[PDB]
Design a protein around this nucleic acid. Structure first.
Lengths: 438, 162, 256, 133
RNA sequence: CCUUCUCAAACAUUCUGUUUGGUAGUGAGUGAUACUCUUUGGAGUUAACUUGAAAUUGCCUUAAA
């Protein structure tokens, strides 16, 4: 099995990998990490969110650490991670090593702060994590302060990247990118062969194709919340006396953070997961929850990949996540699952019911809606009179709010959300501590 | 002479009664006098010299400060005099609050505002967050300036006066 | 007594009537109904009663509602000058023994000021269920709390005599909040021909508590008030017979 | 054309025909003053109707007071279309309980206790749930 | 431009105990279950709900001048 000792990489590199709690590396990783080490292009395909972060990742600190002294100025490697969510996460895997030294890591993101962005690019970030289009902005603008020395190029989660509407961004970047000594890589977990004929550019010899490989026993629960400030008493979901097994989707790590301390003060079982946890507490928490029966946890599209705690009574789909691929077809989670029982609710600001129709365009007959009270006065004041992280500073629980609107913001045609109405505008009815949020 | 629509919006002010009410309110909120701060800080001075702090309240009156509360937006009601020596200063407030949906209210005299604040003049004095006691008197108050001032006086936006 | 087995078949076969599949909180509440010739005449009186009961459904109300949606919690009303005498963190050292703790100790001064504005009022009192007060203020409570929260035996305040003799000291609050807690079930005595004491919640302790409750309460009030007929139900129910007394019935002819 | 009457809503506590006529006479002597009071538990419904002399008095008093504020209450007052005919809402009061009973001997009333309870056990017998007594 | 019944006795001497008393509302409306009544007179009473103190026609002069 793949362990840290064989590769004979730097003591700090894998010595710090020893701090992720991994005592060894998986078969998808064993199928890849030493196999990659070469001028050899690699095309990743494997289990969804199987841990390939390490897999295609370790090339970066390897190639660069061999060149470590070098350019340090021309940014070494570029990853393209389409989804604002997974982008910020796999950057969470750029945080991976304290013993990362020679490297710096660009968070280059849709909806981040441009002046902040390039204002930090002038300092010569060593390795960056981007999203394609506004990345075109910075290689059209700042390229002299960044661009030409590039080493390795990897497309991570090629999923929507290669699909239509990012193609201009792509063919433009790769056409501009210094392919000369560039190391071409196209990665994903699982995507089609149509990638190939869409990959015809930035493929030269050396590559090889690595593959290591709604459910109707389950109905998808449904809710309609008019008030875009929508909050829920999970106690009536928890009326079983402390005993529930509940999984709760929401958008971003900032947001799961907020809801975590907040719903910690409405006194519920509190266990959470996001990019900002290290791998240590991702282990402790998720495996603690496989050692847990009574309780809940909150997971964004990070843990939407393959991770198993069985027979979860409830999958809360709250603030609908990225991908209707996963949204629709990951429901063999409960059934046809580990064959546990429960259902999955999503709290919908009203107008987006056409998403529902899109889902019923994906032709699952759906049922439920009940009467949650967005007029529960308590939860109205039980949140936004009380102050905590925005009570630390004027910059914080905002950041909760921000994060929500940015992940919600990236979606335009992806979701049904109209540029005109609630996207982003009328949803600002959820704005602040101040209410009504004009 | 004929005067521009953006002027003559002064000269339309709050009545005897509604103004009287506004001061029935703010006269609770007089920002503490100087000898006051000297008071409390002397007593506590001796206390912690030998021998738990609710957020203080007042009206927020700095002109720069006031426009600062707006555009955030913070404030709830704003009181604007009718007479500023450089009449220029305030001309943009009644528009501003307008576009920002803030309850601005024209109250007559800068001595009259200036007196509630422990100053000689203000020409602008306003508040945002208030104690819960009068919160209802606030909601109704702003409802009264909406209803009196705001409602039928859209006309003032056009119509050169004079 | 009255027959035990009667109300026991009524409470168990009652568990049958509630065995069939908010609204739940509507259904499951077991209510004890009682009648008479007439209740106390031509006076609206808001005086409450401290019943002596087998035990208190307080503690089950707490623990079973600790997960509830409403999540009831505790008040009490101090006098003007006792407030600064009894702090909040004072009385916390003590109450814990029985597992029972207040939230907020306010002055009616604050009810008459900050908690007036009838929506701010009713929204401030409606999230409670069990209430406290003090007698000396309770006399003044009618005008302040206002005509809404006397519509619930829940919200209408229990009274108590807190003050000791003379110059009250806190010991009697410590033990006497327990006195108003553990053995006692306040209940209200309105006009008319009919009173239904709100009794309990079925999902709490086995009928062994509830039937004895029915006994002690039933024969309790039977004594003084010369009741006519007694029923029990679950909030919804077509009434369940227990003690059908036509003996004292003829007392109607006594006066007339 | 509107009416001579003025609809008045939002009437505080302590504001009645004493105060209604008392104040509004300043606009001229008014024909009618009515405050809508409660059928029981004596107090008002917080609104009432008026009429003064002529349409003009209604103009005056209304517009002068239409948004006027008092105590906690701003008083919305406005005229009505032609006519509108103040009709009802006599002065009410709190009508005390009159108690007549119980004229019969325990014969038919204690009977109706009997037959009523017997047929009661009939009722729970329809439920059906079987009891006694 | 108004400011709210914030306590009693009795009993027994215990850093408190025992016991009986003393409290008429802003209104509007939701309402499925009963009690009770009396000759239709429907009267008093029965869970618990919404609410910006929201609305439409239930027969003393010194707190002056």
């Amino acid at each position: 099995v793949e362990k840290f000792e064989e590769l004979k990489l730097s003591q700090p590199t894998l010595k710090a990998i020893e701090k992720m709690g991994f005592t060894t590396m998986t078969s998808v990783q064993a199928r890849t990490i030493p196999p990659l080490l070469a001028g050899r292009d690699v095309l990743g395909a494997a289990k969804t969110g199987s841990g390939k972060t390490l897999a295609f990742l370790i090339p970066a600190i390897e190639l660069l650490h061999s060149l470590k002294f070098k350019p340090r100025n021309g940014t070494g490697i570029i990853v393209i991670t389409p989804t604002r969510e997974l982008a910020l996460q796999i950057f969470g895997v750029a945080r991976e090593l304290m013993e990362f030294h020679s490297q710096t890591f660009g968070i280059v993101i849709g909806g981040a702060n441009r002046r902040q962005e390039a204002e930090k690019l002038m300092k010569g970030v060593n390795m960056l994590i981007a999203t394609p289009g506004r990345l075109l902005d910075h290689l059209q603008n700042t390229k002299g302060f960044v661009f030409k020395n590039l080493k390795a190029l990897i497309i991570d989660e090629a999923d929507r990247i290669l699909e239509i509407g990012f193609e201009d961004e792509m063919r433009q970047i790769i056409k501009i990118l210094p392919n000369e000594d560039r190391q071409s890589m196209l990665f994903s977990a699982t995507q089609t062969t149509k990638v190939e004929d869409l990959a015809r550019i930035s493929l030269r010899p050396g590559p090889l194709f690595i593959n290591v490989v709604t459910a109707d026993g389950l109905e998808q629960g449904y809710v309609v919340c008019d008030s875009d400030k929508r909050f829920l008493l999970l106690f009536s979901f928890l009326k079983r006396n402390q005993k529930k097994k509940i999984i709760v989707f929401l958008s971003s790590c900032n947001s799961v953070k907020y809801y975590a301390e907040l719903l910690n003060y409405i006194d519920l079982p509190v266990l959470e997961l996001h990019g900002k946890q290290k791998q240590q507490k991702r282990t402790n928490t998720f495996f603690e929850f496989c050692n847990a029966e009574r309780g809940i946890l909150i997971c964004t599209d990070v843990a939407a990949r393959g991770l198993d705690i069985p027979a979860v009574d409830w999958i809360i789909q709250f603030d609908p996540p990225d991908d209707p691929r996963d949204y629709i077809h990951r429901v063999g989670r409960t059934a046809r699952g580990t064959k546990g029982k429960g259902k999955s609710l999503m709290f919908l600001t009203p107008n987006e019911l056409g998403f529902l129709r899109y889902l019923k365009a994906s032709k699952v007959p759906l049922n439920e809606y009940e009467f949650p009270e967005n007029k529960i006065a308590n939860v109205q004041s039980q949140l936004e009179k009380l102050i905590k992280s925005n009570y630390y500073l004027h910059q914080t629980a905002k950041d909760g709010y921000r994060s929500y609107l940015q992940a919600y913001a990236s979606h335009s045609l992806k979701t049904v959300y109209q540029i005109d109405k609630l996207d982003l505008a009328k949803v600002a009815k959820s704005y602040g501590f101040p209410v009504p949020p004009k | 002479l004929k005067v521009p629509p953006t002027i003559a919006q002064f000269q339309y002010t709050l009545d005897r009664n509604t103004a009287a009410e506004t001061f029935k309110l703010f006269n609770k909120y007089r920002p503490e006098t100087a000898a006051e701060k000297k008071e409390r800080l002397t007593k506590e001075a001796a206390a912690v010299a030998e021998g738990a702090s609710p957020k203080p309240y007042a009206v927020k009156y700095g002109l720069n400060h006031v426009v600062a509360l707006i555009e955030n937006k913070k404030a709830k009601l704003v009181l604007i005099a009718n007479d500023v020596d450089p009449i220029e200063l305030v001309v943009f407030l009644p528009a501003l609050c307008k576009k920002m949906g803030v309850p601005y209210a024209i109250v007559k005299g800068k001595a009259r505002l200036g007196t509630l604040v422990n100053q000689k003049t203000s020409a602008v004095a306003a508040l945002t967050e208030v104690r819960a006691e009068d919160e209802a008197a606030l909601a109704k108050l702003v409802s009264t300036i909406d209803a009196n001032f705001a409602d039928k006086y859209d006309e003032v936006k056009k119509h050169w006066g004079g | 007594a009255i027959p035990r087995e009667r109300v026991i078949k009524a409470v168990n076969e009652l568990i049958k009537f509630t065995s069939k599949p908010e609204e739940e909180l509507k259904k499951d509440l077991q209510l004890i109904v009682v009648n008479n010739k007439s209740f106390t005449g031509t006076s609206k009186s808001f005086k409450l009663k401290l019943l002596n009961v087998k035990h208190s459904f307080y503690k089950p109300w707490k623990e079973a509602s600790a997960t509830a949606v409403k999540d009831f919690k505790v008040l009490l009303i101090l006098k003007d000058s006792d407030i600064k005498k009894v702090s909040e963190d004072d009385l916390f050292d003590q109450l814990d023994s029985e597992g029972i703790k207040v939230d907020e100790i306010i002055c009616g001064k604050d009810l008459k000021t900050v908690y007036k504005a009838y929506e701010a009022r009713n929204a401030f009192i409606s999230q409670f269920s069990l209430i406290l007060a003090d007698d000396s203020i309770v006399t003044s409570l009618p005008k302040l709390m206002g005509g809404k929260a006397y519509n619930k035996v829940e919200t209408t305040p229990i009274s108590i005599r807190t003050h000791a003799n003379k110059e009250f000291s806190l010991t009697t609050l410590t033990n006497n909040i327990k006195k108003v807690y553990m053995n006692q079930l306040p209940v209200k005595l309105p006009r008319g021909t009919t009173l239904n004491v709100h009794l309990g919640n079925l999902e709490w302790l086995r009928p062994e508590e509830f039937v004895d409750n029915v006994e002690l309460i039933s024969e309790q009030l039977i004594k003084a008030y010369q009741i006519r007929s007694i029923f029990i139900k679950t909030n919804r129910s077509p009434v369940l017979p227990l003690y059908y007394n036509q003996d004292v019935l003829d007392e109607l002819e006594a006066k007339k | 054309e509107y009416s001579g009457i003025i609809y008045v809503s939002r009437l505080p506590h302590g504001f009645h025909e004493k105060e209604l006529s008392k104040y509004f006479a300043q606009f001229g002597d008014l024909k009618e003053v009515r405050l809508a009071r409660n059928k029981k538990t004596g107090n008002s419904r917080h609104y009432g109707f008026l009429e003064f002399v002529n349409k003009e008095d209604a103009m005056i008093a209304q517009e002068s007071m239409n948004n006027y504020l008092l105590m906690g209450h701003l008083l919305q007052v406005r005229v009505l279309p032609k006519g509108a005919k103040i009709e009802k809402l006599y002065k009410y009061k709190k009508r005390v309980l009159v108690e007549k009973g119980i004229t019969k001997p325990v014969k038919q009333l204690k009977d109706n206790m009997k037959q009523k309870h017997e047929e009661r056990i009939k009722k729970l017998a329809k439920s059906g749930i079987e009891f006694k007594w």
